[PDB]
Design a protein around this ligand. Structure first.
Ligand SMILES: CCCCCCCCCC
Ligand SMILES: CCCCCCCCCC
Ligand SMILES: CCCCCCCCCC
Ligand SMILES: CCCCCCCCCC
Ligand SMILES: CCCCCCCCCC
Ligand SMILES: CCCCCCCCCC
Length: 433
């Protein structure tokens, strides 16, 4: 008896697909708004943060194998307690808010495509509709869409290959050169904090590590390769879009930026292709996030453990979790705007990453690595976290309290859940590895 395993390239594709769905087709507009022409440099900077985090994930994942992902690293370092417990809930939440992000991104490209007006109602309906669709998919087609994921990722990479290389032919180099004004530089740095989520490949990979062939080798390789691929794609797309459309026209077309940005150099067929590619990209990212991420993370948080053998591409256990995940996802999507959801997601990922970096530090004699680099990584991510919170405090204080309420709500829930259920975590998550 054995799990259906992913090869290296399938694992790479999975992370690349999720990352592109979020960065290219969901939050790209927000980046044009905050970073403007410095957006290409924002992606690079966010990629540096991602690589610093990757240093820890790759060292830990070469030694520890578990579908519990970061929660296995954390348990191995600090044992079982309310922190470990709350982090398992937080990892689930990170998938929940990502679902809101994808739903929003889908609505943004979908409504202009069908000529529907942008309303608070039309947006709301389309988000509810797309989430409900992926919820229902559990019962009829989540595995089949799963088999289509690899081919959707290839196609959107080609489409974005076209966008990059055709776009570069006609770019104005005069709007490609980085703006070094103090306010252009500081917008670039604030955006980088929001755009940390652009490299959210860690989740789907490590939550699938036992379903990955030769995981001690291929989990670290998939994390590193996928980050490098998307770094090149993002920079190519930001330059091409920015060099072809007035920066203030990117911002008005925020919800579907790249389809409007394709028009100058690919005409109405480019608008159509980018829009259709966006819908498939986001769709495939949502399937990977729900069936592969959220299903795993919910069961681990609820049970304190996972089955040794299960189908990743369905809601394999505790079906109530599927409805809870979808309902909370729709809630976040209705309450906040794209920049809001992006900020909350990025904040949550940073807290997970900090505890992984800490775990790497505690377990350094066992897993290896340089203590200097690990401390450096921790300080960077913490700094970026606080920059994000500061930015929210001055820009949108509702988002600020939203972020704080999430962390606090998660910790309080853990204490109450642990007391009600007696649920505990053990080294049986990773002991066999
Ligand atoms: C608004 C409901 C959308 C219906 C699902 C369509 C599948 C997405 C593929 C483009
Ligand atoms: C549906 C996945 C397509 C098969 C790709 C396998 C990658 C191995 C090299
Ligand atoms: C993430 C914590 C999940 C708690 C829900 C348990 C409900 C049990 C349904 C029978
Ligand atoms: C919002 C929670 C929905 C309740 C789920 C119960 C159905 C499980 C079968
Ligand atoms: C916060 C209390 C939630 C606990 C529900 C009990 C799950 C059934 C076993
Ligand atoms: C605030 C610290 C509470 C720790 C006790 C929780 C353990 C469950 C009994």
């Amino acid at each position: 008896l054995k799990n259906k395993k992913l090869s290296l390239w399938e694992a790479v594709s999975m992370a690349v697909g999720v990352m592109i769905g979020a960065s290219i087709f969901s939050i790209f507009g927000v980046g044009a708004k905050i970073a403007g022409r410095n957006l290409p440099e924002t992606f690079i900077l966010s990629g540096i943060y991602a690589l610093l985090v990757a240093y820890s994930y790759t060292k830990l994942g070469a030694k520890i194998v578990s579908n519990a992902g970061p929660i296995a690293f954390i348990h191995k370092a600090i044992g079982d307690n309310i922190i470990t417990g709350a982090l398992s809930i937080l990892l689930w939440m990170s998938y929940v808010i990502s679902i809101a992000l994808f739903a929003k991104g889908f609505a943004g490209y979908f409504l202009p495509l069908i000529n529907a007006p942008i309303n608070t109602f039309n947006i709301a309906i389309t988000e509810i509709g797309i989430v409900a669709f992926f919820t229902a998919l559990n019962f009829f087609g989540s595995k089949a869409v799963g088999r289509a994921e690899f081919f959707i990722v290839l196609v959107k990479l080609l489409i974005l290959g076209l966008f990059i290389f055709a776009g570069l032919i006609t770019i104005h180099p005069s709007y490609v050169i980085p703006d070094l004004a103090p306010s252009a530089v500081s917008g670039m740095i604030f955006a980088s904090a929001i755009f940390f989520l652009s490299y959210m490949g860690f989740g789907v990979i490590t939550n699938a590590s036992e379903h990955i062939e030769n995981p001690k080798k291929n989990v670290p390789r998939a994390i590193f390769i996928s980050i490098l691929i998307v770094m090149f794609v993002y920079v190519g797309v930001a330059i091409s879009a920015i060099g072809n459309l007035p920066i203030d026209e990117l911002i008005k077309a925020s919800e579907n930026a790249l389809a409007v940005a394709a028009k100058p150099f690919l005409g109405n067929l480019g608008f159509l292709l980018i829009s259709i590619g966006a819908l498939f990209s986001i769709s495939s990212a949502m399937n990977a996030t729900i069936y592969g991420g959220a299903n795993v993370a919910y069961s681990l948080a609820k049970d304190g453990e996972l089955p040794e053998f299960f189908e990743r591409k369905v809601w394999f256990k505790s079906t109530e979790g599927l409805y809870i995940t979808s309902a909370l996802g729709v809630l976040f999507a209705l309450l906040f705007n794209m920049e809001g959801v992006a900020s909350i997601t990025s904040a949550v990922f940073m807290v997970i990453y900090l505890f992984v970096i800490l775990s790497h530090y505690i377990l350094i004699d066992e897993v290896g690595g340089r203590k200097e680099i690990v401390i450096f990584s921790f300080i960077v991510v913490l700094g970026v976290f606080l920059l994000l919170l500061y930015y929210q405090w001055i820009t949108n204080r509702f988002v600020f309290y939203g972020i704080i309420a999430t962390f606090i709500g998660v910790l309080i829930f853990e204490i109450i859940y642990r007391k009600v259920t007696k649920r505990t975590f053990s080294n049986n998550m990773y002991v066999k590895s």
